[PDB]
Amino acid sequence: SIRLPAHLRLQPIYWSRDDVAQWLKWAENEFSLRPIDSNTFEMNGKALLLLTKEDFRYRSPHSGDELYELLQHILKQIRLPAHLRLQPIYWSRDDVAQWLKWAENEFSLRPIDSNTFEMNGKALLLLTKEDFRYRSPHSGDVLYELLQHILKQRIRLPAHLRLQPIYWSRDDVAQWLKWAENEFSLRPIDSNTFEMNGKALLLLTKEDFRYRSPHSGDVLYELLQHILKQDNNTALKKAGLKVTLPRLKILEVLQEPDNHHVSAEDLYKRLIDMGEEIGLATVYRVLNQFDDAGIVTRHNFEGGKSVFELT
Amino acid sequence: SIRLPAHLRLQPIYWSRDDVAQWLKWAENEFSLRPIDSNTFEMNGKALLLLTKEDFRYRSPHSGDELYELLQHILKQIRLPAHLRLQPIYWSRDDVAQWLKWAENEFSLRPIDSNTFEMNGKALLLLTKEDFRYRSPHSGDVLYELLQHILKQRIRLPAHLRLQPIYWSRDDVAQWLKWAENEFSLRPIDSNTFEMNGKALLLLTKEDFRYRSPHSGDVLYELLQHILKQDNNTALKKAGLKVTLPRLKILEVLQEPDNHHVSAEDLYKRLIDMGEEIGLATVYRVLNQFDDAGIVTRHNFEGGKSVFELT
């Protein structure tokens, strides 16, 4: 029992950006609210539907909770461009940029500059909602919610950097920055961005990361926060294979200090010496199934002389 | 009852490229075949399994049928890099190139030069098996079969060019070439590649297309061959909507010579004059559902004054 004009009585999914603005103006007068600036929700009705109640309160502290609930009352009676149908973990930097361009058209947002998110989908997924708001004051909340919706519809370090950040040296910090530039497709990260060790890097606030690095500081800080939060029978199961005696034994021989690298025939000869009763072609099949399941690597040599190496 | 050595008695899926070669040499001697050059199948066993019987006969006219059937006798007792999980219709030119690089690693092929297929996935899908062989004498048949397998696991012209090729002028031929360069991501197609009309273009063999255009002639010829081969109740159904009287009428008013572009209120007023009994908010909802279903386009104007245009 709230009377909107005819073109606002349809489903909000249909409301243009002007319809959104006429709705706000209608509500302000209907409910004696504080003035609602015509710029408070620069989007269409489809975009407004993606916003959380918290996003309403954030855009309109005087009236947002009220507008959200007015919207639920009104309600009580997504396919992307071809290259973007992948899980966002796989979007390239170019994809992210095409995602922005699609989104700005789909949702009538204010112009999203093409350097707003210069990073790949993996990096995008590291950012917080706060970081989307910061990069995009007009549309960051819609964009973040857009992404969460795309996720409903559906990172390990280099070896030289797998020790706690607290022990990193200046040099490690430097290798981290250039590892992260490549992994996350970020703008160039000049070698002097963070001239310090891990202990000092751990003292910086996210605002320090942003100042040192306008293009990538938020990604880098959340990467750091991520990094800080993050029996042969089972060995076989864990790699996808049924336990058999021929598998256990061969696996056993490969775990000998001498037999890490071993060819099929030597493995066989080694099995016999131990008094095991296993056939030659069986040794070949096991080690190749082991290869396929990541337990060993086959290194080829002509005529049944490949050497198998336990990974 | 064919006795291979131990490492060739495993499943062919496991055979390296050398194992393939030792198998051929074994077969040649076991079956008194003509000499089989060690270069006849430069691939691993996984690749050999993708080849058709026809590919066997083509690689070995003296012995291929025989090798294929030996292989079926032996048998009688695919996940791509992340960016390539899309239907191949969507692969970019860069994807195609990454597809080649993955394939050459996966299958131990001879080196596939990165300019072997300079075109996008749509273009790749136009090529015949013969064109894959021509572009890649060592691996083209495997690659084509690889693609068919990826498809089991799962183009309209610009308006100025939708008339039969037989009527194309020189100028049209020229617009076709640059439309196709953009659509298929081909190398630059110099304006002098085909200085002639559609009737003459239709006289050229595929070999003429290849000579005029080493980078793209086969794509262009198959594009040409593709092009040459290729009631309101139903109007509503065809666009995804249940027939209702309010829909039929509005659709009817929009098909008037005067009302192609019409706003909701005028449509309403026009319905009344005809003695129709339909409410104003209903006119709004229909035209917006029509918009969403491609029957009209909504052109926005502030305050319920959008003009709707029949597409």
Numbering used by the authors:
A (entry chain A), B (entry chain A): 11 to 87, 98 to 174, 183 to 258, 271 to 351
Anything the authors wrote about it?
The “polymer driven crystallization” method is based on the human TelSAM (Tel: Translocation Ets Leukemia, SAM: Sterile Alpha Motif) domain. The SAM domain of Tel (TelSAM) forms an oligomer with a 65 helical symmetry. However, mutating residue Valine-80 to glutamate (V80E) renders the oligomeric assembly pH dependent.
Here we utilized a tandem repeat of three TelSAM domains instead of two. In order to avoid aggregation by rapid self-assembly of the resulting construct, we selected the N-terminal domain of the ferric uptake regulator (FUR) protein from E. coli. A flexible linker was used to connect the n-FUR domain to TTT, in order to allow the n-FUR domain to sample many orientations and select a favorable position without restricting the orientation of the 2-fold axis. We determined the structure of the TTT-FUR fusion protein to 2.3 Å by X-ray crystallography. The identification of this mutation allowed us to place this molecule first in the sequence in accordance with the design, with the V80E TelSAM first in sequence, followed by two WT TelSAM molecules, and ending with the n-FUR domain. The organization of the 3TelSAM portion of the fusion achieved the expected structure, an oligomer with 180° degree rotation per unit that forms a 21 screw axis, which can also be described as one dimensional crystals or fibers. The 2-D layer is formed by TelSAM fibers that are interdigitated with the n-FUR domain. Importantly, within this 2-D lattice, the n-FUR domain is the sole contributor to the lateral contacts that connect the TelSAM oligomeric fibers.
